[PDB]
Design an enzyme around this catalytic site. Structure first.
Site, PDB file in Angstrom:
ATOM      1  N   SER A   1       0.826  -1.208   0.000  1.00  0.00           N
ATOM      2  CA  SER A   1       0.000   0.000   0.000  1.00  0.00           C
ATOM      3  C   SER A   1       0.861   1.259   0.000  1.00  0.00           C
ATOM      4  CB  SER A   1      -0.962   0.007   1.194  1.00  0.00           C
ATOM      5  OG  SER A   1      -2.083  -0.825   0.950  1.00  0.00           O
ATOM      6  N   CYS A   2       2.128   1.100  -0.376  1.00  0.00           N
ATOM      7  CA  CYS A   2       3.078   2.203  -0.363  1.00  0.00           C
ATOM      8  C   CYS A   2       3.345   2.732  -1.779  1.00  0.00           C
ATOM      9  CB  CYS A   2       4.371   1.753   0.314  1.00  0.00           C
ATOM     10  SG  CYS A   2       5.078   2.972   1.433  1.00  0.00           S
ATOM     11  N   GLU A   3       2.501   2.308  -2.721  1.00  0.00           N
ATOM     12  CA  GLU A   3       2.646   2.628  -4.147  1.00  0.00           C
ATOM     13  C   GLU A   3       2.287   4.074  -4.502  1.00  0.00           C
ATOM     14  N   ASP A   4       1.598   4.758  -3.591  1.00  0.00           N
ATOM     15  CA  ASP A   4       1.266   6.175  -3.756  1.00  0.00           C
ATOM     16  C   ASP A   4       2.105   7.024  -2.794  1.00  0.00           C
ATOM     17  OD1 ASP A   4      -1.486   6.955  -1.577  1.00  0.00           O
ATOM     18  OD2 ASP A   4      -0.165   5.197  -1.434  1.00  0.00           O
ATOM     19  N   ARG A   5       3.293   6.518  -2.476  1.00  0.00           N
ATOM     20  CA  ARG A   5       4.147   7.126  -1.469  1.00  0.00           C
ATOM     21  C   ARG A   5       5.625   6.810  -1.728  1.00  0.00           C
ATOM     22  NH1 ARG A   5       2.792   6.847   5.030  1.00  0.00           N
ATOM     23  NH2 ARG A   5       4.277   8.468   5.683  1.00  0.00           N
TER      24      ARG A   5
END
Length: 477
Positions: A312-316
């Site tokens: 869930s770190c793909e937008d970060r």
């Protein structure tokens, strides 16, 4: 007397360059005056200049397709000027009656004061870096293929804005339908309030450095019922794109664990930063990659950092990048980069933690927002706050920091936030910091192994390592 006009014009005729039909020009000039016509057309005559005095009563002037470098004093009641396709480097005072100004395809670096009754202005294909204050009854402003990086206040009567192929870093503020042609600019993000504009308004955003996350988010909510917005919708290629062979040297690491996932990071990182030129960022990433190509351990550990931050770190990518610098720091520390420089390591710690706090703040602001990437906000903070918060290793973008919804108050709040939060958490944060532990393993392995045994939730690690830190911190006084 009309004789004064005729004599001056005849004198002017004889300074024509060989391919220049000043003779037909004088016929037209004379015809125009004699008959007191309101229109004068001196099109396609290869004019290299115009006479100093033009028929004073003309209401419409066409001087299209010549080699004019400048224009003479324009007639006082002129309503319509087409001077497109010349080599105009400046313009004379524009008469107050001007309704229509077409000056497409010249060499204009600026425009003069724009009179109140102007309804149409075309200055496509020039070299403008700026527009003057726009008249209050302007209806259409076409200004494509210049070098603008900002517009002035758009008037309420504006109905079409063509700023295609310019250097705009953000969408023009909106002032009957309204049309914004903004293709081929450097718009990296749009405002969130954008979708609450009325459907009489239509925006073209096709071909901008807008990230695919931003783009896909747009397609998602414009599809759901119920402002028309037109927009566009592995593995050794990813490392090469950050330079300048390095591609062939990197080709050897193609069939390594988590290779595919590392090319995914770089390309997402690129999609978020690639419009910055300067930055800045590009140079730092390349040097970092150079270090990765030299060590097998650094490479392998970096790939797993990319992998573990994919759930869930793909937008970060901001966080992932901050962790990849951590991994570089840890690797460097374990190879003795800090002795005797426990004070330098302390200074750098303060710097890293400051950036980590700013990343928290960036993520907080963006976490709900769909039309801006964290990196936009994070770099904005960085470039505006590096001096005050003394961030030496910060990327200082020269452009793109004019982000929608980041206010001056956010900037100040952030700075203060970094200070108090630092004043409260640094010492504890540092005692848990990776590179610090690498120093403690490499140099003070005596107290380290003893503190590892002393441990027999994370709360306990905190208490044990804070103890260990405040111990060793006393030695380097």
């Amino acid at each position: 007397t009309y004789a004064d006009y005729f004599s001056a014009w005849d004198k002017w005729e004889k300074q024509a360059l060989p391919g220049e039909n000043r003779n037909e020009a004088v016929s037209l000039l004379k015809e125009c005056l004699i008959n007191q016509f309101s229109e004068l057309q001196l099109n396609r005559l290869n004019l290299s200049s115009l006479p100093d005095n033009l028929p004073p009563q003309i209401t419409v002037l066409e001087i299209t397709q010549n080699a004019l470098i400048s224009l003479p004093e324009l007639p006082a009641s002129l309503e319509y000027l087409d001077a497109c396709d010349n080599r105009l480097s400046t313009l004379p005072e524009l008469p107050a009656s001007l309704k229509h100004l077409d000056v497409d395809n010249n060499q204009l670096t600026m425009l003069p004061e724009l009179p109140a009754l102007l309804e149409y202005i075309n200055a496509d294909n020039n070299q403008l870096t700026m527009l003057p204050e726009l008249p209050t009854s302007l209806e259409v402003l076409s200004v494509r293929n210049n070098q603008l990086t900002f517009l002035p206040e758009l008037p309420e009567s504006l109905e079409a804005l063509d700023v295609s192929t310019n250097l705009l870093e953000s969408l023009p503020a909106v002032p009957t339908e309204i049309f914004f042609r903004c293709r081929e600019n450097r718009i990296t993000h749009i405002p969130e309030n954008i979708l609450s504009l009325d459907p009489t308004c239509t925006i073209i955003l096709e071909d901008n450095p807008l990230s695919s996350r931003i783009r896909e988010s747009l397609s998602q909510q414009t599809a759901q019922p119920d402002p028309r917005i037109y927009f566009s919708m592995p593995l050794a290629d990813a490392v090469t794109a950050w330079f300048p062979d390095v591609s062939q040297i990197w080709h050897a690491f193609e069939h390594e664990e988590h290779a595919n996932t590392f090319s995914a990071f770089l390309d997402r990182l690129s999609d978020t930063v690639s419009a910055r030129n300067t930055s800045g960022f590009r140079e730092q990433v390349a040097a970092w990659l150079e270090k990765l190509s030299a060590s097998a351990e650094l490479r392998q550990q970096s790939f797993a950092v990319a992998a573990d931050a994919t759930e869930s770190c793909e937008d970060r990518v901001a966080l992932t990048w901050n962790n990849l610098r951590k991994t570089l720091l840890v690797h460097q520390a374990s190879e003795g980069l800090f002795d005797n420089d426990t004070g330098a390591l302390l200074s750098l710690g303060r710097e890293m933690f400051r950036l980590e706090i700013l990343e928290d703040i960036a993520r907080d602001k963006v976490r709900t927002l769909h039309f801006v990437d964290e990196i936009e906000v994070y770099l904005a903070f960085q470039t505006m706050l590096a001096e005050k918060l003394q961030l030496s290793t910060a990327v200082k973008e020269m452009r793109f920091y004019g982000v929608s919804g980041v206010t001056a108050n956010d900037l100040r709040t952030a700075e203060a936030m970094v200070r108090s939060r630092e004043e409260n958490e640094f010492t504890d944060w540092f005692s848990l910091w990776g590179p610090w532990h690498a120093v403690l393993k490499r140099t003070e392995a005596d107290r380290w192994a003893l503190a590892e045994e002393q441990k027999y939730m994370r709360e306990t690690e905190q208490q044990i390592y804070r103890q260990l830190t405040d111990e060793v911190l006393a030695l380097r006084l």
